Design an enzyme around this catalytic site. Structure first.
Site, PDB file in Angstrom:
ATOM      1  N   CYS G  31      46.752  39.326  39.488  1.00 57.11           N
ATOM      2  CA  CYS G  31      45.520  38.428  39.824  1.00 57.11           C
ATOM      3  C   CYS G  31      45.256  38.475  41.373  1.00 57.11           C
ATOM      4  CB  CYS G  31      45.748  37.128  39.381  1.00 57.11           C
ATOM      5  SG  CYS G  31      44.797  35.813  40.181  1.00 57.11           S
ATOM      6  N   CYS G  34      44.740  35.225  43.152  1.00 54.84           N
ATOM      7  CA  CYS G  34      46.026  34.779  43.409  1.00 54.84           C
ATOM      8  C   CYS G  34      46.727  35.304  44.627  1.00 54.84           C
ATOM      9  CB  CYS G  34      47.049  35.085  42.296  1.00 54.84           C
ATOM     10  SG  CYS G  34      46.458  34.416  40.600  1.00 54.84           S
TER      11      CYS G  34
END
Ligand SMILES: NCc1ccc(-c2ccccc2N2CCNC(=O)C2)cc1
Ligand SMILES: NCc1ccc(-c2ccccc2N2CCNC(=O)C2)cc1
Ligand SMILES: NCc1ccc(-c2ccccc2N2CCNC(=O)C2)cc1
Ligand SMILES: NCc1ccc(-c2ccccc2N2CCNC(=O)C2)cc1
Ligand SMILES: NCc1ccc(-c2ccccc2N2CCNC(=O)C2)cc1
Ligand SMILES: NCc1ccc(-c2ccccc2N2CCNC(=O)C2)cc1
Ligand SMILES: NCc1ccc(-c2ccccc2N2CCNC(=O)C2)cc1
Ligand SMILES: NCc1ccc(-c2ccccc2N2CCNC(=O)C2)cc1
Lengths: 211, 213, 211, 211, 211, 211, 211, 211
Positions: G31, G34
């Site tokens: 991600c 992230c």
């Protein structure tokens, strides 16, 4: 017509001593925006008959009155009620704008407060441990009492400035506050004449006791 | 019978618009123009309802190709409101009847208030200023009413180093009826061989120390 | 009134294959915000008569259409232009927000533009130093040409998405643009049918060549 | 520092082939409003590091590029995403407005989507009443499927424009979406190279299937 | 201490004949709002060094200057640029408010325009068929000319109000406009000294030629 | 009576048990703001006929009802829909502001949600691995179920605070949510009355399950 | 370091039953957003030492938890305190926005309220004339009681909707409210577990008892 | 730390009788908003050292003081100067907002007025044709007098309400005003103690003489 034609001589009687709201237009013949609002004022005078009287003072023919109200530009409208200046509006505006101005200011406030303030009822000297309970019990005669604040306030920045007491009485609902004001306002208690009146609920709710 | 709405030509524009009496609203349009068609019945109603205070005129830009470029028209419809040969306001594109009425009322209105401030233009050169001017202005203008304050204002015209400096003399009276008297008695008179402009100055600007207008 | 009522069955014919702009309202009886916007659509249908059809699909009575557009809540408004979804808007809005929405996605509902776009006319590979001048000279027959932009645009965000060419021709006044569009649209040019049409002038004025 | 100083020759590499969002500012030294925003761009290139590159092209030094984008006044900002002009803004603006502008355009980039779009997967001819169920079942191998939309999109206002199919699959949580995309992207299905990629969750949740 | 300490005698020299923008603060020691903005001005002088000089006139010690600008309340800020009053601010404000005020006013405008206006270049009676082409040819030396407009404007509502000519020249890009103004402003043409300057692009784009 | 005159005794029947929307005005005779809005309510009763009934409770004549709604100042407007309190507006206001207040609150929200929440249905102890599937199956009878969440929520920070279960059920389109809510809300299950209601879709889309 | 590593197995202990606030990051290795906040989260763990623990759950390796919270996209941040979800934040953000999100949400409100609401205490049918007096008396143990509202609220517009009772107790000052909520929240009375919690004071003061 | 921690016992001495502006925070240990502002108050105390004392009163440990100010929710900030309540702020706020609140209230006003009001100077019965002229000559001692208004104001709607006189004196510039106020305020003339103070210039400029 429905409009009162004022002079300097007749102002006090027609305006200051009138019963009911009087909307005063300070105007002159050569004034463009004065001529613009003139038809609107005629419409106001019809529609608000019974609630408002429209009056006009021509400032060329009657130069005495306007300076007493700090009139500068024209037109300027002043709304009087029972001898008080309730509101002022400088310059021309639409019929819709004028109506909202009138409606609001004829109402006098946007909301009836649950909070009553008692003025001139005690001196700081008089505050003891019983006073809050006494106020609560006396005011309990008019409705459910939420809270009482015995508030001391210094009137100015000087070291020697006067300390007065304001007694806030917050009722549960505004019908109660109304009954209490009606019973208490202008009453004499032990040598002093009490002022009982509404206190701005939003100020109180926000811990502003200064007004 | 003559239509309420004038169908302008290139040749008639001068007479029918620029030299006309009262406010004239000009619609630049064409037959194939969708939005021009949207506003057509609205202009019909405007021409009826504003009769006496407004003339509605249309210029077909296909049939009269000469005028629109002189006003930097691009898209159509485009509306131009004229008064005394002056462009009072412009509006590009179709709009509602409510919006058009709003546009007209706002722009036909004239001033909201008669100001207490007179400005005197072209009265003195910056070279003429001395310590006495303010006092002399106050005394002369005292004859029309109570003078609150006089400002002798010097204003540079442009950023360029040699820009002209002009003088505006502001006279604030106690109340607007005094200001009116002064303006009427003074405007357009020749003093010391120059024609003086005496006119209202926007009170709100003055009150906020904006002497730029 | 002037609003059109659709069915699942009529949707293809009345919306997709239709000429012009259709604004579709997905709604239901029980929907509070659908009801709120109903009078606003009435006024829009009035004002935009001839440039926009306002259409309504009741999703209870017609369950098949909304899912094909991934409609979730109602009201949802979809603006179609010749079977192309031009724009979407979910949820109630004011009259002014709806106008703003149409203004930004229609263009032709405010004014006839001075800008013409030529699509499917040339391949990127064909662009050379002469193209700007040739387009200028060609389009000069319909009136005064202000500017020509040979614009290249990547279709989609994948590394080897195809590059297309839009040729923008801004004329001095919209009468000239109209003439150019009528003469050029649907003409054969080296293997391809030219699409000539108005381009939103405000978008163009703000350097947005993306629509 | 963080800001790219572009040239005509470097523009294509630096802008159109970049990964993620690029903010391009067309400016010149004599431009007062360009200087006004210089500090703001400085800060923005800091605060948006990792989600946006800030890039400047001086139109005097590099007169080549700006006309290709119909740049008129300066400053002008162009926001590109994977080689597509996503949005534009002409003229000076506050730190506030620039943040509003970037936020409206980059919000989906702040997250991994639960939504996969399948591109170049099927022909509009192939669409029968089984496809939705068949997509649902195949994609159920990667996780819980919330919804599948078989969406047809017309590519232009011209009547014989092409229609393409996008298949949207919304999974329950983004880890499922990632597994699907991993397993499906670049694969061959009935002879087509499939594009399987994340689709902006905000657009999808708002019934915007146009990207 | 980047702050200039003015007197009545130094005012002309320090302010009216200064290089660059000067922000003048008219202030007094006893003034509550003046004291509040004092550290704000200190930081402005630091932050804006080289683009702005901050200068302070104490109106108690130097009572001659403030009445010449119609100062009433203090503090009052006047922003000067090349001996012109660019903007005024009456009363205290936050640092963020002041920065907004300075940013707007230090930029002459929100956008450098593509549009040049030429003033005082021709009398109405000189306008002929050839003027447009001739301006176009002459201005073409500086860049691509989009459009020229020969605009005639009556100066006042009066019967024999002056009619003047404004010649608008819109370039393809603002850098061309800039070169044209540089070369043309102040130049002499058949008897008159021409004013060339930028003209609000947004007004022009909207057919507002009145400014 | 387009305007209903309420008593403490008729309130239940006229307001709580009525079909559609009722605007209750709490008022008194002495109240200037209440008198101001009386004509504006007259207009509202007219314009919203069929959409809304205006009702008035005099708090002096009927002191029972207002305390049960936490009424403080007057006038206070309370909007009911099908015996549900929708919103409250305190104090006098213009007709424009009242129309703004009504439209938004009559609608209820900007959009009808696809998400239902089930409250008061299961205790946390009852949750097993089967619950999600069973919910899914039951709710599948009202339309396509996209996702079900079994959410446990602690009712405050305190050590002994109750844990409750909210069951979230997201349907594919709002018309399915409405069917479910209409079928389930107020039904009896395991000895408790179910609460089934719409849940804000934006909250849900954003993982905010706290409402 | 200070960032704790969560699994499905340890979640309840580490998060729900933690002492002190926990920021949970739902994340995965692939991600991008992230990875973007990951440094930010390390600096936050450092700066908020002793006020906050940062905690991460990888949703690939721990697939059970995030569905219980209606997680969709990642990263998603949840702030927990004493087993409640204080707030949720979807998607990457700056360190500045995250600090802002933490400071407001660690506080849990902008003001501690004087109003307590008691839920699940009585049912409509148990309401009688004694109740208000009874609630006043019990709550007077915790301080001065300003007002009690016995409020009935229908759970939705449908005909069979449940009517629940909320008991509002407004105390004179927030220290009283706090004592009362700590004493009463989660107590069993007549076989029902009551909820005692703060009620938004601004709402209550505005006669909005709906939340 | 520069923060002063107060007790009920010490409050009058340390606050009502302190030198300079005192900011009082009514707080408690369990209060989330109070903990949020704690570090901001630390920064304020340091930044405004010499200009403001920041103090705190814990309402759990010091339960006497807060009710006397009508404190309700916490945190609540009261700003005192010379034993007067200068301003109040309920609830948490950012460092930015507190600095704005403090700067403004420390300043006392946004601008020093040109307008002085003399109160309690004359009785309505003393007014005559010479009074304006006499005020002008006296006030001429301090500076150039623009205008004098002899304003009669009725205090209440009551038919026998008291009528007071306010004398307004507008000077040419604020330094003149200041001199007059400082020389006149608190002086005794003809056996009455006169108030001379600033009057809000905007109210005066708009013909509002009510304050
Ligand atoms: N001067 C006392 C007074 C106070 C409030 C109202 C008033 C009444 C009805 C509706 C609006 C009102 N207002 C007034 C202005 N400001 C507002 O925002 C609203 C009228 C007089
Ligand atoms: N002991 C001091 C004291 C002070 C004020 C009040 C009081 C407060 C509110 C309303 C009425 C009040 N009363 C009515 C009866 N007699 C009174 O003198 C006044 C009562 C007692
Ligand atoms: N200049 C000295 C001074 C004197 C009184 C106050 C003061 C202000 C407001 C409310 C109460 C006040 N007090 C103070 C102590 N004793 C009291 O009982 C009342 C403030 C300063
Ligand atoms: N052919 C004669 C002629 C007539 C009018 C204009 C003209 C151009 C532009 C703006 C105003 C204009 N006028 C000036 C005269 N009086 C007006 O009221 C209007 C120019 C030439
Ligand atoms: N010191 C030179 C001077 C400058 C301006 C004025 C003046 C100002 C205001 C109104 C009338 C004025 N006058 C009337 C008489 N004759 C005039 O020349 C003009 C007067 C004197
Ligand atoms: N059935 C009449 C009734 C309803 C509610 C309360 C009550 C209200 C507020 C706080 C505590 C309360 N109590 C505590 C003691 N015993 C209880 O059961 C509840 C009291 C009586
Ligand atoms: N109540 C007296 C007072 C009035 C103005 C200021 C004040 C001072 C400096 C900067 C801003 C200020 N304000 C205050 C809030 N509202 C405004 O419009 C501006 C301070 C106190
Ligand atoms: N009724 C006659 C009258 C009323 C007020 C003033 C007056 C006005 C403003 C400032 C001072 C004033 N005075 C008065 C006393 N003696 C002084 O020295 C100064 C002057 C006369």
């Amino acid at each position: 017509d429905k409009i009162i034609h004022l002079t300097d001589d007749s102002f006090d009687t027609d305006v200051l001593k009138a019963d009911g709201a009087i909307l005063v237009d300070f105007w002159a013949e050569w004034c463009g925006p004065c001529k613009m609002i003139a038809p609107i004022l005629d419409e106001i005078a019809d529609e608000y008959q019974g609630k408002l009287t429209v009056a006009k003072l021509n400032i060329d023919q009657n130069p005495g009155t306007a300076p007493k109200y700090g009139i500068r530009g024209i037109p300027t409208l002043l709304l009087f009620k029972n001898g008080e200046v309730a509101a002022t509006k400088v310059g021309a505006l639409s019929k819709g704008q004028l109506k909202e101005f009138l409606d609001a200011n004829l109402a006098g406030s946007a909301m009836e407060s649950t909070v009553m303030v008692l003025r001139n009822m005690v001196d700081p000297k008089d505050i003891d441990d019983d006073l809050e309970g006494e106020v609560t019990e006396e005011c309990g005669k008019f409705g459910a009492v939420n809270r009482v604040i015995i508030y001391q306030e210094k009137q100015g920045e000087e070291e020697d400035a006067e300390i007065i007491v304001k007694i806030f009485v917050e009722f549960s609902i505004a019908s109660e506050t109304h009954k209490a004001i009606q019973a208490l306002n202008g009453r004499w208690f032990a040598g002093r004449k009490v002022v009982a009146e509404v206190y701005d609920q939003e100020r109180f709710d926000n811990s502003d006791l200064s007004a």
